[PDB]
C-alpha cells in the first residue's frame, strides 16, 4: 500500500555541492589495487606548509628569488612585502596558491630566510611585522617597535621568522581585492642593522633566498574557487 | 570524520560494493 | 526496490511559515565563535517590560513626554489615555511596538509616573482605570469608583500603577482598528486630589515624565506583521 | 542517498473524505481555553432521542401538533402515520432530521403521546404498529392483531409506545423516496377503544400532543448529506 | 525535513493485476453481517470436481447426454471423446468451464458413467484411455492395450473411471487451439465387450448418462480470461 | 496464505477499519 | 476510538503542537 | 522547547554539521 | 499524514544496469520444477577453461587446426601466435569468446598441444613465451631466453604449456584494437629442437592439434558487450 | 554473494512469491 508523500517546493532542483549520493550503474566491480604507492596526502594544509619561493622584482619586471644586499645603508630597505595573503609575492607560492581555493584564513604565518653569500662574509639584519593602524614604516627606527628579530649571519645559514595573527576578527579573508577594505593586514620589512661585511678577495654583493609557509597555527576554511586566469 | 561531502543519516541504500568500488589488496565432466 | 507512494494533492506548494527544514549546499562549515558577547535576549516579552515613553500633545501637534500640572483644579484632568494597546500614546512605545508584531494580548499592564518638579514642592494625585460599560468619566468623583491610587508626591520620586486585565475573553486583540468593535477596553485617567503646592522662590509649573510597560502577567501570542508605514 | 519510489497511478488526486492530515502553517499556537462551558455532546445519537413534535394536518394545510379526539367512533381513526423515517410527519423532527444526514437505520423507534384534556375527563385508546405484508388497516379490529397497547387516560398524563424493528435486512435505508421499493416499512395507527368521556361543565373536544424519539436500540450509519432545500 | 527520493522510470503507470492496495474514502463503516448463510466455497477447484454433463451428438446437431447402446457390435464404438480439456464435450461442463479461466492443468481426470437401462437388462463395456504416439484406435482390440476397465452392468448403477496424466511436461495447457501443437493429449473410447442383453418384455435400446470431474489430483494455475463468446 | 493479490511487506497504512469493512456478528438534562 | 476521519498508522510527523492547537487550562540590567 | 518553527518528528537527515553551522569555542619527507 | 520528500534531479531516468527490482503483475505463480536436469554451470569462468581449437592458416585462407611439421629446419618456425587475447587465433575460441563479453583479464593462460603423428615417429619441440620489450624473435636461439619447455614426443600424447602473466598493470584489457597501445602483450612461438624423425614405412608429414584455455589463475571482469558482427 | 545486479538494502517490498516465481520440487453436500 502506497505511503502518501508531500512533495516539497524545490522538487526538480540540482544542487552542485549537495551532500548526498546518487544512483550507480556498473556495480560489484572491484578496483585495481594500490598497495605499493607511498606518498598519499589526506589534508591540503599539510601542503601549504612547504616553502615554495616569493619572487623579488628588478627593472624589466623580471621578478627573481633573493632579497639581495650590501656593503651599507638602506634605504627603507631591503624589501617590503605585505602580509595580505594575496600580495604579488605570495601568489604563485603554494601557501597562497592553496590559501586561495579557500574563502578564509587564521593562524600564524612563517617567513624563512636562507643566506647565500660567501662563508668569509658577515652581516646582521633586523626583521619586523608591523600591524595596520599607522602607516608603512619609512625607517628601521620606525619599524623596530614591532615584532622582530635581529638575524646574525653565521654558520647557521637560515632564519625562521613568523608573523602572527594580530587580528580582531577570529578569521580573515584569503584575499579578493575589491578594495582594501579594513580586514587586511600586514607588512613585513627587513633592513640591515649593521652592514653586510667581507674581507679582501670576496664579493661585494650577495643574494639571500625567500620562502613563505603556514606555521603550526594556519587554518583555511570555506571552499570556493577563484579567479579564471590563463597565464601568460 | 566522514567521507567528504556526503552526510545524510541514511547512508546508502544500494550496497557499497554497488555505489563505489570494492577495493582490494595484492561442475565437471569426470573420467 | 521502489516503495509505492501516493502523491498528495498539494504536491508543488511552498508554505511560508512551514515548520520543516530544506536542503543545505555549503556543509561541515564551522561558524566564527562568539564567546565574549554578553547581552543575548532569548524572549521578546523580556523586552516590552522596559518603559520607553508615552508622548503627551500641545498645539502644534508636538506631542512631548510629561503629564505636566498646577496650582489647581482640573478640569477632567490632567490627562486621559486609554488603554487600547494601539492608542496614540502607547504607539511608538516598545510595549506597543512589540505588542503589534503579535495578534493577541493578555495580562496586566503597568503605568509608571516619575515627578520632575522642585524638591521644595508638594502635590497629590488620584489615578484610575475605568472599564468600559458606561462612559469616559467626566469628573474625578466619577473616576474614583474605579481601580486607583492616591499618589503622594514626596521623597520617593516615582509611582507604580498597573491597570489590570478586566476582560471577558481570556485574551484581547493587540489592536487593528477596523472599528472599535467591543473587545477593546480601557481608559486611564489622572487628576490632582489636592493641588500641587510650592513656597516662595519656586516654580509654578512642573512636568512629570510617562513610561508604559508589560507587568509580570503580560502575554503576546499569534505572530503576524502589521501595517506598512514609512514614516514621516 | 535517495530512496527509489514508484509513483502510483492516482498521483494528483484530492479525496474529500480522505482519512489523513495535511500540512500546517501557524504552529506552537495555543488555543483559548474552555473550561467553564458545560453541555458538550460527543455523539449525535444522544440527540435524536429527545422528542421534538410530529405536525398533524387540517384544511388549509396548517399542520399543527396534537392528535385531537372525541365523544365517539372513529372512523379508521384518529390518525395514521407510517413509519418510514422520511414521512411527512417525522420530518422536521430531530430524529428524522438527524436520521437523514445518515444512509441507514436500525433499532427500535419510540412514539410518546401526552394527553392535554381536562382532568375531569376520561378516554381509552388502542395503539398499534402494523407491518407491511397485507394493507393499511381500515378498522381497529383489523389493527389490533398487531403490536399495540390500550392506553387508559388517567392521572398519568403520557404513554410510551415503541414500534420495533420487524425487519428482514439487519438495516434499513433512512429514506429516499425514488419509489417505495420494498425495504420500507411501517404504519402506526391509533383509535379510541372506548370513547373519550366527560361530565357536565367540560369540554367536548380535546387535543393530545405528538413527539417521536430513537429508543435504546436506535442506530444511524453511513454518513451522507441529503437533499438541497431552502425552505419556504 | 524532506527525505530525497529517486523517482523511478514507470512513475505514472497503472497495473491491472498489481498486488497492492489503494486509498479509501468512506471509513469506520461497518458491514452488514452475515452469520446465517451456510454454503461458502473458498477454492474453485472444490467446484470443478462435481460432474455436470458431457453432451453426446445426433443429426440435427442436437447433442444430448447419454452414450446410448445395443444389442450388438460396434463399430469403433460407442463413442470417443478426447481428452483435450477444451473438446466439444467437456466444454460447457464445470470442469472445463473453470479449467478455462486458467492457463495450465495437471493431475488426473475422472469420467463417471451411470447406466439408465432396464433392471432386467445386462451389458458389459470395455473402457480405455489411449495416449498420443500412434493414432486413434480403430478397434477395441487396438484399444485394450491402454489403461481400461471392463464395466459389468449390474445392481451397482455407476462406474468410475479416471484417465491419468501421462504427460512429459509437469503441466499442460488448459486448451487454446491455435493448432494442435504436441502438448495435448488424450482419447477415451468405450465399446461393449459383450453385447447389452435383455429378455422378453424389455427394450431393445437404452441410454447411459455422461459426467466429467477433476479427481484428487487436479490442479489449474495461471489465471487468465478467455475467449469472448455471446452465445447463441 | 494471504489475502488475495495483495502482497507488500508493509501492509496497510490507513487502518483496516478504514481500508475494507469492519465485519461484524449478530449527557443529561436531569430532574 | 480514534480521532475522527483520521486513520493512518503513522500519525503525525510535524508535532501535535504543530498540527492542531495546544489546548490549555485556566537578562538583566542590574543595580 | 524546540528550536523555532521546526517541528517534524524526523529531525534532520543530512547532519547538523551539514544543515546549520558547527559552532565553536575559543606525511613526511624525513632526514 | 504525508511525509515531505525532496525530489531529486534525475526523477524520470531509466538506468539499464540499475541494481534494483521493479513492479510485478502475475504473482503467487509457481514455476514448473526442474529437479532432474543435471549440468547447471553458475560461473562463466568455469567455461573458458575448456580448450576449443585455435585455427592455423594456408593459402586459400582456409585456416584449419594443427601446427603441422617435418623432417627438418625451421625457419622461424612452426608458428607464432601472439598472446593478445583478441588475436586471429584465439577468436572464435571459447576463452577468447567469453573473454570478450568482458572489459579486463588477469591471470595465467594455458596452451595445450596434442601430437597426431604416427606412433613409430619421434620429434622434439622447443616452446616459448617472449614478452614485449624487444621484437618478435626471428630464431629459436633468440626465443629460448624466454619461458619455454622442450617437448619430447613419446607415449604421452599431449603437452601442457602455460604462458604467464608478465604484466605491469594488475590487469589487462580483453582486447579492442583501436591500436596497439602498450598494454598488450605476448607472443608464443614454437620450433623443433631436433627434427621430427620416422623409419621406413611412415609418413613424412604430420599434423599436431591446438587448444587454448584459462588456467587456475584466469580472471575476466567489467561486463560489456562487444563488436556487432553477422558472420559470414 | 547476492543475487545478481540487485543490491539495495531494502529488499523487496512485495513478496518473493510475488516478485519472482515460487519454485518447487517433485465444503460438502453430505449423505
From Swiss-Prot, chains A, C, D, E, I:
Disulfide bond annotation, renumbered to this chain: 87-89
Protein location: Virion; Host cytoplasm
Domain of life of the organism encoding this protein: Viruses
Protein role: Forms an icosahedral capsid of pseudo T=3 symmetry with capsid proteins VP2 and VP3. Together they form an icosahedral capsid composed of 60 copies of each VP1, VP2, and VP3, with a diameter of approximately 300 Angstroms. VP4 lies on the inner surface of the protein shell formed by VP1, VP2 and VP3. All the three latter proteins contain a beta-sheet structure called beta-barrel jelly roll. VP1 is situated at the 12 fivefold axes, whereas VP2 and VP3 are located at the quasi-sixfold axes.
Protein name: Capsid protein VP3
Segment of the intact protein contained: 415 to 646 of 2303
Curated annotation (Swiss-Prot), chains B, F, G, H, J:
PTM field: Myristoylation is required during RNA encapsidation and formation of the mature virus particle.
Protein name: Capsid protein VP4
Function: Lies on the inner surface of the capsid shell. After binding to the host receptor, the capsid undergoes conformational changes. Capsid protein VP4 is released, capsid protein VP1 N-terminus is externalized, and together, they shape a pore in the host membrane through which the viral genome is translocated into the host cell cytoplasm. After genome has been released, the channel shrinks.
Signal peptide: none
Tree of life domain: Viruses
